[PDB]
Structure formats: C-alpha cells, structure tokens
C-alpha cells in the first residue's frame, strides 16, 4: 500500500500555472485591450456529466493574474457534477477574466477528464472487490496532478515513481540473477520499501511468492490463469492485473476477484471535458 | 499567414524534460540497482500505425540522463511510422536505459498521438481545398509542443497565444469599432473576428477583418458565407468538430476548419521499449 495523492503540492501547482500563463500570454493579451476596463461577472458550465478536478489550479491562475478576481465554487474537486451545471462563479475585471479564461478551463478540462475516465472504470467494477491502480504512463510534468485526478475519480495510486517503491521486471530478473536474488537484494538495500515483481508465468508467480514479495503484477494472463493465480495468492501476496486494460475488458477481469487492476488508459489518454466560460 | 511551428525552442524542451525526469526519478531509481552495471542494447517499437513526434524530447532526455547512450533514429519527426516498425535504437548502460525509458515513451506516445489524430483528419479532407487549423485548447505547458505535433501531422497553426494575433470574440464585441481600434493599437497583426451569424460576418468583412471565424453555423449558412466571402476574407469554421462531422463541413469549400479536438484530447500511441 502506497502513499495516496490527496492534494498536489502548492509549488507544483504554482510552477505549472506560471509556465502555462507565460506560453500563452507573453507580452500581453492584445485583444483584451479592446474591452472596457471595468468589473463584471461570469460563470463556468460543464456541457456534460463529469468528475471535477482542478480547483487548486484555477485558483492559482486567478491568484497569479489578478488577486482582485473573486471566485465562488459551487462544486469541489472529486464531486460528480451534473451536465449543464455551474461549477464556479467569477466577479472581477473583464480583461483579467478574459485572459484567465483559456488557461483556467484548460486545467479543468484535462484533470476533470482524467478523473472522469477513472470514475467510469470504477463504476464498472463497483460490484466486485477489485480496486483500480494507476501507473507511470502519465503526461510529462503532470505526474502528481494526474495521480490526484485519479484519486479524485475513485482510483488509488500505484507507486508515484522510481523512488518510493520497487518494481522488478523481466529486464531486472534477467540481470543479477532471477527472482529470489532480485527481491533479496532489494530488501537488503532498503527494507522499508514495497517490493513488487512483474511476472508472465504462474511459475514466476510462485517464485515471487516464495521470495516473499509484497505484491505481484500479472502481465497479460489469460482469464483462466488469473483464476489460478488468485487461488495461489489468496492470503499470500497481493495481486495486480496488467494487460492493456480498458472499459471493455475490465469487467471480465474484475469477475476473477483479483485485488487490483492496473490501467494506464486512465492517464495515457485524455478525453477532455467540454466546458464554457459565460462572461457577463 | 500565421507563424508556423517547425521546431520547439530548445529551452522549452530542456525545462520540460528536466521537470518530468525530476518528478519520476527524485533521489534516484531504486530498482535499477538490481540490474547489472553493464552496457546493453535496445530498440523502441510502435504497435500501431502512427505519425512520429518527440525526437527532440527523447534526445534531450538522453542528454540529461547519460550522454553515453547512443541513439539511432530509423524514422524522424513527421514521418508515417508503420505498425510494428522500430523507431530508434539505443546502445548503452542498462541502468540509465531502464530509468530513461518511461519518460522517453511518455513523450513520444503523447506527441505522436497528437500528430496522429491530426493526420487522420487531414486524410479525411484530403480531396477538398480545406486546411486544418488548431486552437489554444492545448495541454498546459505543451502549447508550442502541440502546435508542433499538429504541424507534424499535416495541420496548420492558428495564432500561438493571446499576444501574436487579434481574436475579436463576442465579449470584445461593436464590430466596426473593435476592428478599427485594433489596427490602431497595432496595424501589424492579423485581425480575426469570431461571428455567430451572417449579419455579423457582413460587419466584419465591411470592417476589413483579416479572417473570420464562423461559430456553429448550419451547413446552409456556411454555404452562404463561403459565397459572400470569396475574394474578401478567409473563412475558418469552429463548431466542436470531430472526425464524424469534418467531411460535411469540408464539402462546403470553406478555407479553414478549426478543431480543438486535435489537441485537447490525447490518444496515446502504443509503444514498447524492448531492452536487449
């Protein structure tokens, strides 16, 4: 069991916003200069049902552009927002608002996208005991941001990276000897770390179990083999299933009762949520 | 017409790669210590047809991790890579390679994804005079990256941001005035006006706009517009367009089609790095 990302660190939210504003704004929003320099009002809708994620970023965009803009949130991160509902309201300067706009909803679109994908898969497997794990198949620079989205949507965090946990693969098993060696060396270095071994075989699974691993990733097992594995592993090691899984394969696998299902699809791809800022 | 992005500026590539390595690596890849401190070989394969994008990022990752890794590219940025073809070959240290892998893949799968979707749409409108344009609906921090992924795929760049061209939308909008004050402030920029109807289009033409964006027109009204605008202003059609509606719009003969889908969504190409 890994650390769960239940908030993105501020310094990471800040830097990501900063760089986002720059790439878009540079010397200045030239078209905003054509708008009356006054206060007004605005609000943001979804056009579709969604799991909100991105409050912190949107907030940070406001904060960096014009602390004068007041925001009120009608929904918070990790909530199911109904299609056509207002997520937040704005009161402030027209120019600032028109400038904040695209950046703000580019963060919500994305992260709510990620959260909403996750939630789908989760509802798909809500009847089974299985849980959803994410991966490192992330958008660069958005490792933590996406771990957070996935949590926001119902999913739990597989290891954050290469440092917090051990993941022993074919490539690793091949080198410095096989499985027993690998795990043993791995405990010797740091005994506090979770040791996971990926396998392609039931035989490799027995090894990793025999070597006293903490959890075992099943790479591309047949249904039947997953069944075998579960029997073998019950009470011994935690099991996580990997095999390019999507909304169309997850249920069959979840019916097996493996503890965990790894899914890169939930971070790898993005289905952005359709948003709109209504300014007036 | 607009600035086209045929290369991502070095520092952008550097800063991106640096932060993505940091976020993955931290104090260091602990699992790599189990692997032999030996030289080996590897290759990266695509498991589907695809347009390649992200060379600069893969290279730059190598450079930050271990300049002792040798890379050979069998396909370059903006080529069509066939399913199951190798993209590049590595000769180098097992540990450095195992550690570089995911960040490397994470870049190519993303940008080639963007270039690949873009290419699909282009092929769809292949038989018409219509050209594909992008938007500002990109991934935070990947503005230039994705303008480049789009160029790589056959698409063309709409303005880069809020600084390089005018875009008079409903909120700024009357029209005549707004255009006039724009050329005052800066006669040197493209003035674009987004319209919701044919009367506004008349206004924007009458005000000598550079290009005009049609927001959610019927086919019929798009037809009319085209007729009106021939030889006057360039037309661009925005209306939440996807692979399923682009052809109908292209048949109209409008100059440009605006698609946010090509960058706001991400369909990652499937990749694998076979080490050894």
Residue numbers in the entry:
A (entry chain B): 7 to 286
B (entry chain A): 7 to 179, 184 to 286
The article reads:
Francisella tularensis, the causative agent of tularemia, is classified by the Centers for Disease Control and Prevention (CDC) as a category A select agent, and its role as a biological weapon is known to have been investigated in the United States, the former Soviet Union, and Japan. Here, we demonstrate how a combined computational and experimental approach based on metabolic network modeling, ligand- and structure-based drug design, physiological modeling, and whole bacterial cell-based assays successfully identified novel antimicrobial compounds in a highly abbreviated time period. Third, we carried out homology modeling and X-ray crystallography to determine the structures of the selected drug targets for subsequent ligand docking. methods, three proteins [3-deoxy-d-arabino-heptulosonate-7-phosphate synthase (aroG), nicotinate-nucleotide pyrophosphorylase (nadC), and d-sedoheptulose 7-phosphate isomerase (lpcA)] were readily crystallized, and their structure was determined using molecular replacement.
We constructed and expressed full-length or slightly shortened recombinant proteins for the remaining targets to optimize protein crystallization without removing any functionally important regions. All structures were prepared as full atomistic models for use in target evaluation and ligand docking. Given computational and experimental limitations on the number of targets and compounds we could screen, we selected a diverse set of 10 candidate targets across a range of metabolic pathways. Our selected targets, as shown in Table 2, included the three enzymes we were able to crystallize (aroG, nadC, and lpcA), four protein homology model structures [shikimate kinase (aroK), pantetheine-phosphate adenylyltransferase (coaD), chorismate synthase (aroC), and 6,7-dimethyl-8-ribityllumazine synthase (ribH)], and three existing PDB crystal structures [enoyl-(acyl carrier protein) reductase (fabI), NAD synthetase (nadE), and 2-amino-4-hydroxy-6-hydroxymethyldihydropteridine pyrophosphokinase (folK)]. The success of generating crystal structures against some of these targets was greatly helped by the availability of genomic DNA, express primer service, and robotics to clone, express, and purify the proteins and to screen crystallization conditions. We mitigated these risks by considering multiple (ten) targets. This proved important because only inhibitors for roughly half the metabolic targets (four) affected bacterial growth in vivo.
